[PDB]
From a paper:
pmcThe mature [name]-1 capsid is a conical, fullerene shell that encompasses the viral genome. It is constructed of a lattice of approximately 200 capsid protein (CA) hexamers incorporating CA pentamers at 12 highly curved vertices. The surface of the conical capsid is dense in protein-binding sites that mediate interactions with host machinery necessary for transport of the capsid through the cytoplasm into the nucleus. Here, we present structures at 2.6 to 3.5 Å resolution of CA hexamers and pentamers within in vitro assembled conical CA-[name] polyhedra from multiple lattice contexts differing in local curvature and geometry, alone or in the presence of Nup153-, CPSF6-, or Sec24C-derived peptides.
Additionally, through visual inspection of the hexamer–pentamer distributions revealed by cryoET, we identified 4 classes of hexamer that make contact with a pentamer: hexamers contacting one (type I), two (2 forms, type II.a and II.b), and, in rare cases, three pentamers (type III). Next, using reference-based classification, we identified classes of hexamer that were adjacent to pentamers within our original hexamer particle set, which we then independently refined. These yielded reconstructions of hexamers contacting a single pentamer, resolved to 3.0 Å and two reconstructions of hexamers contacting two pentamers (type II.a and II.b), resolved to 3.6 Å and 3.9 Å, respectively. Hexamer–hexamer pairs adjacent to pentamers are highly tilted (black, gray, and white points): For example, the two symmetry-related hexamers in the type II.a reconstruction are tilted relative to one another by 45.7°. In contrast, at the most highly tilted hexamer–hexamer contacts, including those in the vicinity of pentamers, R143 is positioned below the helix 8/9 loop and Q176 points upward. CA molecules that form hexamer–pentamer contacts form a defined intermediate configuration in which Q176 is above R143, but the backbone at E175-Q176 is in the “low-tilt” conformation (third column). At interfaces between a pentamer and two hexamers, one hexamer helix is removed from the bundle and instead forms a new contact with helix 11 of the other hexamer, involving residues A204 and A217. All hexamers, regardless of tilt or twist, share the same structure in the “pentamer–hexamer switch” region.
Numbering used by the authors:
A (entry chain A): 1 to 86, 96 to 221
B (entry chain B), C (entry chain C), E (entry chain F): 1 to 85, 96 to 221
D (entry chain D), F (entry chain E): 1 to 85, 97 to 221
Write the structure that this text describes.
Amino acid sequence: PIVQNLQGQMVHQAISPRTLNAWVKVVEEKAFSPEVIPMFSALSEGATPQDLNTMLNTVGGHQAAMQMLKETINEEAAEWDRLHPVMREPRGSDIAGTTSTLQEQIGWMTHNPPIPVGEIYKRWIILGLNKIVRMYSPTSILDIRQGPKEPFRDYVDRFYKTLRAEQASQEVKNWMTETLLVQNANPDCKTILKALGPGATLEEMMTACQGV
Amino acid sequence: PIVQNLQGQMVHQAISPRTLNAWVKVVEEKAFSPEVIPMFSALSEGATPQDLNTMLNTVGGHQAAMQMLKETINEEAAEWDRLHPMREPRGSDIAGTTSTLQEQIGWMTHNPPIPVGEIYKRWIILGLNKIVRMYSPTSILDIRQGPKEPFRDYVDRFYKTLRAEQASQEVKNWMTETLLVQNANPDCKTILKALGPGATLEEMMTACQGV
Amino acid sequence: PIVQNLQGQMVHQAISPRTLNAWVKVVEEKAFSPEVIPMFSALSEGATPQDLNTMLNTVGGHQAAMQMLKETINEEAAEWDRLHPMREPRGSDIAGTTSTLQEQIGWMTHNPPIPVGEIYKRWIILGLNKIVRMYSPTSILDIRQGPKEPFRDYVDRFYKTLRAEQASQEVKNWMTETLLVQNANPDCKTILKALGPGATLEEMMTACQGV
Amino acid sequence: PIVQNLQGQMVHQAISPRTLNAWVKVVEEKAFSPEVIPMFSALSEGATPQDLNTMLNTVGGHQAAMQMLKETINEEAAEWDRLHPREPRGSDIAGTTSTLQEQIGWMTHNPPIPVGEIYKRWIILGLNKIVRMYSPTSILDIRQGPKEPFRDYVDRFYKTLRAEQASQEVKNWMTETLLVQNANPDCKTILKALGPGATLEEMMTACQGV
Amino acid sequence: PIVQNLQGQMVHQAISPRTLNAWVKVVEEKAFSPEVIPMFSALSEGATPQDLNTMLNTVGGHQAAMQMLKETINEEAAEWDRLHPMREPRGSDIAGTTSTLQEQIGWMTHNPPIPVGEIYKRWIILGLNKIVRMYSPTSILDIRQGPKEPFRDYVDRFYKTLRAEQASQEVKNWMTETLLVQNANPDCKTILKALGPGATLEEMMTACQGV
Amino acid sequence: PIVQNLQGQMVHQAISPRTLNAWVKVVEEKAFSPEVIPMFSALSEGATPQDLNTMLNTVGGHQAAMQMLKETINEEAAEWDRLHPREPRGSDIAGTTSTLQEQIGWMTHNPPIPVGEIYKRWIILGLNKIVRMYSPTSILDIRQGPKEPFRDYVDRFYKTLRAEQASQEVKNWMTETLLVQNANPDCKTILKALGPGATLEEMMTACQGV
């Protein structure tokens, strides 16, 4: 993070050991289930690129994913260097915290109009984690279907946990929640859902399918 | 939360990692048992809408409940826009989706403030109440005392179910007066009906010690 | 709790997540063993009625006890409205149910203060007392020394029961004097009669090390 | 503990939940091993009598000891009321008849009237009696087994000697005399090949692996 | 670390006991898996040479590694004395063995600073790199896919080995492009050949979903 | 430790309960492995003699070692009382005959008399002697098993070498000569094929997978 000292100057605050152990436990145990993007954003709230790189590099397992993340970050950094051609201006490799010192990072993050390289880099990281969370999704939302003896609450849990991993826009996710959840239900249960009419809330749908 | 910085400005304090681990543990272990509403309300005591959204979005399980929560928030956000035609916060601003963190801190620190973190925490608690009612594992009419079950343990099950049911107080009065007696063992029920109608819960449990 | 902000303003401080995790663990592990009341009074030392309600409402188990507690708080609040016909707090205001947190701060920081957090913590401790003396597993008259049981272990059981026992200190004095001897083994009871009627517990246990 | 607010007024700081859980775990697990008194003196360092009473009242188990502790606190409080005929009474120092505001008033007076320190002395005087009673056997009964390592016998001897009540001159006599005389006949022979007053380092070196 | 006191003097603050317990657990659980380098560098962001020596010397296990580390540090310190013939630090001063920590505070806060903590943390990381390479459980050429092993798990094992593999990025490029293909199962290798040579890792893993 | 209050006065900060639990765990679990001395030094970097006495006295086990520790502290304190004829006596540096306010006084005079550092040196001298005694065998006895990995033998060799009292010239001779000569005969054939100047990195590179 960044803090201002008693001397009246901006300075680093090292990312806490408990925060790193929390992040590593999150990544290792939850294996890029979609709640990893919000835990990353929450744990990383003040992070400099030094802190962000510390969070990524301290992950031990999932090195396939951490490579796909690194390859995404490099793709975003290359796109940055295209969109932003040539306190110095940061290259993409500077925002990724690779060719920049921590004092350059704090210099940008506290400039008069700040260049928020920690936020910009945290975007590129979340863009990479999104692709990983999609890749670790057990199936596509069009394939999530209710088993012949599966409770509707458990199918709804599977549906909405898969929908979090979809790269659909919210307009398409809206259509999915409205249409696929009924379309993919178990035919007895599906008959109950259609008997509510198509506009039913999820509370009404799950109320109707209690123990069905 | 919001904190006065050393520059004197009102500034965001990030919701603690230990607070998020506590919250996510609470939700995923206790699975919308009714004590989740007061733990939520405690852990979020200072929360901006960004912090509240962080607490909700960091839950991994129970995505049926978390969607029912989001649909409740959208319903309350619409009712807010019906009630309510710096900038005026509208429903998606209270919910922290269309409002920036500095708009949220703006409203929460104006004079008089618009306490968008409190307003949103109300809409969340409304959604969590609906979930806690839906996740009640069996109805109160199904809570019965087993033939060798201590009355104290049956009462624990009965009142734990009454928390989850969200019934109105006259109906809880009727249930605690009549079902708590009538679902007891035949002998324990014989004791409890001998106490007459006015028995306090202390008196009912006192009478059934060691039955 | 209540704290003074850097602007010199009296303001509420959220009851810490570690304090609530500690309290909820204390209640649900120790099951109203008498040390739950000292832990409650420790963990709630500056608590507002909102903080006290947060501590009670976050308990998930023991909903029989938590109902007897609520039932007691309502009885003490009704007695407060009999005793007591800025706005003056009624019993439901002390209990934090009809009062806002800013009212609670106002009462707790007025001059002279109306210490509604301390008053309400009295009513909670009265309810926990009534619960502790019901979760007590047996009467002090039932605590006896087993034929091969060390006197130190019997004394541990006697005084742990005597904490949960309802009795006033004059009666506790008589119990420590008379029952502690009379319920011992005939061997220990012989040694302890040889000490005469007046012996400290240090002397009694000193005499019964090798018996 | 005691802290000064940003208003400059002296105020209470609540004894931390981790400090109470540490203390209660110490008393419950370690069962008045002598190390309990240094842990008490460490955990209670800034404690007002209300903090000290919280530490004692939360212990839960060992209610024989905790009753002996309050009985000897009352012994000390009665002696205080004899030796010192508003000034605190013994019941005020014990935190029973005094409010937290009175306790802080005394502890921050000029000169400070340190009722938390005075009461912590009475508590440690009571825990001494308890540790001396929960001691499993007399120092004179600690003897070395036929194949027991001298290092483990010394561990047992000095752990017993911590709980032993005697003065340091007596403990000097005990460490000189009994540790040798109660040693295994092999070790006892080695310790007679050493000088009569060898250091414990020398004694343990000479008997290492004997 | 170094922190300025409220009296304005620059002074050392020791690494937290929690930071040490974290480091010692990291080393002794993770046993020079490559994530030890970034945990070391994270837990020592502001460390003086005395802080760094405190981290190294508190490791109990792996005294083979800790000796290889020590004699690497001595090689870098000897090279520093070759490159560099208040007082100017020798290599043994930067290693924190011959210098006082007051000299370390001096050098690290001089203008311009002589950043002996950062220099020494480089020598430590160069030694830990050699140890992570040494403790690597097998060669990258020996990582192959089991007959029913998911490609995702094989790629995890491959890139986890490729972190400890010291080879330059030109050779990592060749290995990721051609060994990862050729060390796969015959079915999975057939899928990866059908992509042609230019596939990114995301494409390779996309293709081998459910192979 | 020593801290300055919000009033700017010099103030004791109590040694943290979590730090004491960490130290107590270190001593009970790791039983004077040589890394106990670095852990001790790290957990006590700001300690007054009262904090240091709290760290020692809260140890439960190993009362043989803790007696050796306190009686070598008495030896160092006696040597200080000879070598330095208020000025603190050795018993004051050891925190026995001095108050906490005297200890802070000496630690904050100009120039300071850093009694917490001087005493921490005497404690480390005693932990040195204890670590050298609790070492389960001498380095001459460390040998490689018939099928033991050279990396595990090296781990055992250097973990033993940490606990040796040997000077660095002797440790250089030992690491050069014994580590080779006590290696398994096939593994020793590899190491001999490296020639005399091999680094430990080279020796392990050669014997990895022997």
